[PDB]
């Protein structure tokens, strides 16, 4: 619940990004502060993101919820798998 409240606060006042491609772009540019991934993810698809995070030394959080759950926590009506926070 703490992570959901924190993400709600970030969305209210911050800068974030949804999508694997955009998250990878933020990692490449070095403008990322934290990456959150849902649990129902394909192994290779999640492995590429985890490898990039490890290479860039960026902290990574595992949501332990569905992508629909992550979308609802984000307060949207669509499913999201990956989230990248650029400014808190």
């Amino acid at each position: 619940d703490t992570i959901n409240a924190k993400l709600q606060l970030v969305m209210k006042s911050g800068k974030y990004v949804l999508g694997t491609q955009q998250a990878l772009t933020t990692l490449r540019q070095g403008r990322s502060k934290l990456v959150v991934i849902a649990n129902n993810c394909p192994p290779i698809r999640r492995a590429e993101v985890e490898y990039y995070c490890t290479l860039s030394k960026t902290p990574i959080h595992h949501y332990s919820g569905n992508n629909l759950d992550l979308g609802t926590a984000c307060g949207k009506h669509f499913r999201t798998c990956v989230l990248s926070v650029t400014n808190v």
């Binding site: 290779i44 492995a47 590429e48 490898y51």
Partner: peptide, 30 residues
């Protein structure tokens, strides 16, 4: 093109995981 890219990435990442696991086992053994 997407299938080729997926195969390339999968090959590289699997080989890295295998190397790390084997090195860890040998370092625990020695």
């Amino acid at each position: 093109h997407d299938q080729v890219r997926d195969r390339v990435v999968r090959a590289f990442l699997v080989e890295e995981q295998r190397i790390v696991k084997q090195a860890l086992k040998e370092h625990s053994k020695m």
